Structure formats: structure tokens, C-alpha cells
């Protein structure tokens with residue numbers, strides 16, 4: 001796997017979204033991974049619908065929280081997920097209104113990365129593309145991050161609370177990091193992204209709950 005890879009430079013990443021006051025991070029994390037694969041497969045990069053997920057995944061709890069794995073299964077069984085245009089994000093839970101004529105993508109499963117294995121996470125990013133990951137984003141240092149490779153010894157590998165997207169990896173000024181796309185808008189972090197510590201003992205549980213869909 002290359003020493004560094006940024007899928008943004010490859011055009012596998014859609015612009016940063018804002019989940020608003022809805023706990024839909026799992027939906028945005030899921031959508032980002034699917035958008036990455038849709039690109040790999042069809043050559044087109046389109047915005048998929050996180051709202052479709054929020055309203056339709058009964059195994060998850062809409063704005064109350066959920067898992068990316070449940071989301072991928074829903075897309076697989078549903079046999080499709082609508083585009084952002086066919087199913088706009090409102091940021092509130094509503095009855096499932098899936099429209100098959102707005103179907104932009106499909107899913108045939110998901111693969112999970114071994115718990116805590118950052119080497120596996122790396123191998124996966126360099127081969128498949130953007131991977132969905134869960135981290136502990138409760139620290140106020142994470143909240144106010146603006147630049148550099150983020151790392152705070154207070155981060156909790158066993159307190160995963162935020163779903164996010166691993167969009168690449170590399171090294172800054174001697175510090176290896178993961179390129180993480182957040183869903184807290186552009187005004188957050190570095191234009192919506194954060195460089196998180198790579199190989200520093202599974203920083204924030206970055207490699208504890210990762211997965212990606214198969215098409």
C-alpha cells in the first residue's frame with residue numbers, strides 16, 4: 001500500500017456535509033463510503049441520501065443513533081439507496097419515503113476490519129477506498145481542532161461515540177495520520193476535515209469499528 005493516499009485528490013469524495021442537530025453521523029459515515037465505491041465502480045461521484053437511511057433503517061434509531069453496518073444491510077436488502085436530490089436531508093426523523101425512481105446506488109454487503117488493527121485499516125483504504133470508522137469525538141480538543149495531526153491522550157478507544165469517514169492516510173511533519181472527513185460542516189476543523197494520529201496505539205479507537213460496503 002502506498003505511503004500516502006488521499007482519495008480527495010482522486011475525486012472519490014463528495015463535499016463536506018453538515019448533519020445539523022440530528023444524530024445521523026452513522027448515515028453520513030455510511031453514505032460517504034458508498035459514494036466512494038460508486039465512484040470506483042461507475043466512474044461517477046454523486047451525493048447519496050443519508051436521510052433515506054435515517055427514515056428507513058428500523059434497526060437504527062434515526063437521529064437517536066445507529067450503526068453503519070445496519071445501514072449497508074438496509075441498502076443491500078432494499079436493493080438501492082436514493083440520491084440526495086431524490087431524498088433531501090431535512091435533519092429530522094420522518095416516515096420512510098424511499099422512491100425507487102431516485103435510486104442512485106446499490107449494495108451487496110459489507111466487510112469489517114479486524115478490531116484495533118490499523119494495519120488492516122491501511123491495507124483497506126489503499127485498496128478499496130474511503131472506509132467508515134467510529135471514534136471517540138467527545139474531547140473538547142477534538143471539538144476545537146483547526147490544524148495539525150490531532151492526538152489527545154484523554155481520547156477513549158472504548159468510548160466510540162461518533163461515526164466518521166477515513167478518506168486516506170499519510171504523514172505530516174514526521175507524524176503519521178489518517179485523513180478524516182467529518183459531518184460538522186466546512187466551518188469545522190480544517191474545512192471539514194481532521195488529521196488524526198496513525199499508529200499511536202489506536203488513537204480514539206479509530207480502528208475498532210471500521211467497515212465498508214461491497215458492490
Ligand SMILES: *[C@@H](C(=O)O)[C@H](O)C(=O)N[C@@H](CC(C)C)C(=O)NCCCCNC(N)=[NH2+]
Nearest residue numbers: 023024025026059060061065066134160161
Ligand atoms: C453520531 C452523531 O450523530 O454524532 C451518532 O450519535 C451515532 O450514530 N453514534 C454511534 C457511534 C458509533 C457507531 C459507536 C452510536 O452511538 N451507535 C450506536 C447507538 C445505539 C443505537 N441502537 C441501534 N442498534 N439502533
